[PDB]
């Protein structure tokens, strides 16, 4: 299945201004799991996708292959149809941490 929709140039090395590392987590909100209460293959953009103080924190992009655990809640403009408004708990787990760059940043 050669296509490759989206784009990526990343590289291989620590994490940077704005990249997207890729980490497994799993947590609950209100103390109960909900829907994103588990990921594995989880494509965090290091300052593109409001990275709240908890993915800031853990998923910061410099452990590849770290275990850790932050509490992650979403403010009220990011509202988005699969988890808008997701104040809730998480335990992550950090991995392939590169350097994407999608934009051209002239």
């Given at each position: 299945?050669?296509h490759m929709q989206a784009?990526?140039?990343?590289?291989?090395?620590?994490?940077?201004?704005?990249?997207?590392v890729t980490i497994d987590?799993?947590?609950?909100?209100?103390?109960?799991?909900?829907?994103?209460?588990?990921?594995?293959?989880?494509?965090?953009?290091?300052?593109?996708?409001?990275?709240?103080?908890?993915?800031?924190?853990?998923?910061?992009?410099?452990?590849?292959?770290?275990?850790?655990?932050?509490?992650?809640?979403?403010?009220?403009?990011?509202?988005?149809?699969?988890?808008k408004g997701k104040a809730?708990?998480?335990?992550?787990?950090?991995?392939?941490?590169?350097?994407?760059?999608?934009?051209?940043?002239?």
């Amino acid at each position: 299945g050669s296509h490759m929709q989206a784009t990526w140039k990343e590289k291989d090395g620590a994490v940077e201004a704005e990249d997207r590392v890729t980490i497994d987590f799993t947590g609950s909100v209100d103390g109960e799991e909900f829907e994103g209460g588990k990921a594995s293959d989880f494509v965090l953009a290091m300052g593109q996708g409001r990275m709240i103080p908890g993915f800031e924190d853990g998923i910061k992009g410099h452990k590849a292959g770290e275990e850790f655990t932050i509490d992650v809640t979403f403010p009220e403009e990011y509202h988005a149809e699969n988890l808008k408004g997701k104040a809730a708990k998480f335990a992550i787990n950090l991995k392939k941490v590169e350097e994407r760059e999608l934009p051209e940043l002239t």
